[PDB]
Design a protein around this ligand. Sequence first.
Ligand SMILES: [Zn+2]
Ligand SMILES: [Zn+2]
Ligand SMILES: [Zn+2]
Ligand SMILES: [Zn+2]
Ligand SMILES: [Zn+2]
Ligand SMILES: [Zn+2]
Ligand SMILES: [Zn+2]
Ligand SMILES: [Zn+2]
Lengths: 37, 46
Amino acid sequence: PKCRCGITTCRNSRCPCYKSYNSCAGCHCVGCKNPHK
Amino acid sequence: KPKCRCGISGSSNTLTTCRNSRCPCYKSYNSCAGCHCVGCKNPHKE
DNA sequence: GCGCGCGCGCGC
DNA sequence: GCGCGCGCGCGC
Ligand SMILES: [Zn+2]
Ligand SMILES: [Zn+2]
Ligand SMILES: [Zn+2]
Ligand SMILES: [Zn+2]
Ligand SMILES: [Zn+2]
Ligand SMILES: [Zn+2]
Ligand SMILES: [Zn+2]
Ligand SMILES: [Zn+2]
């Protein structure tokens, strides 16, 4: 997967990676706050 | 009349091409005569 | 071809 | 009824 949040960011259900319990490795988000390592 | 470039890139749902509100022609109830769209699905005619 | 940004639409 | 991620037309 690969989100585009930020143009709580990536820290909620509206973000795929968060929801799927994955990190934003390779994502195109901005100001990512996904705590997933 | 407007001139859309709908559908040029590859990655795009080909069944909604010139058949939704993002198309100026479709939205303005125009045909795509003179347009440069690829895979036009516009149901209007004049 | 790429990136910007608009606006659709779903999930709450 | 709202909010924002995402699909894609458009300027360049
Ligand atoms: Zn995200
Ligand atoms: Zn992500
Ligand atoms: Zn993120
Ligand atoms: Zn069109
Ligand atoms: Zn057209
Ligand atoms: Zn068309
Ligand atoms: Zn469904
Ligand atoms: Zn279903």
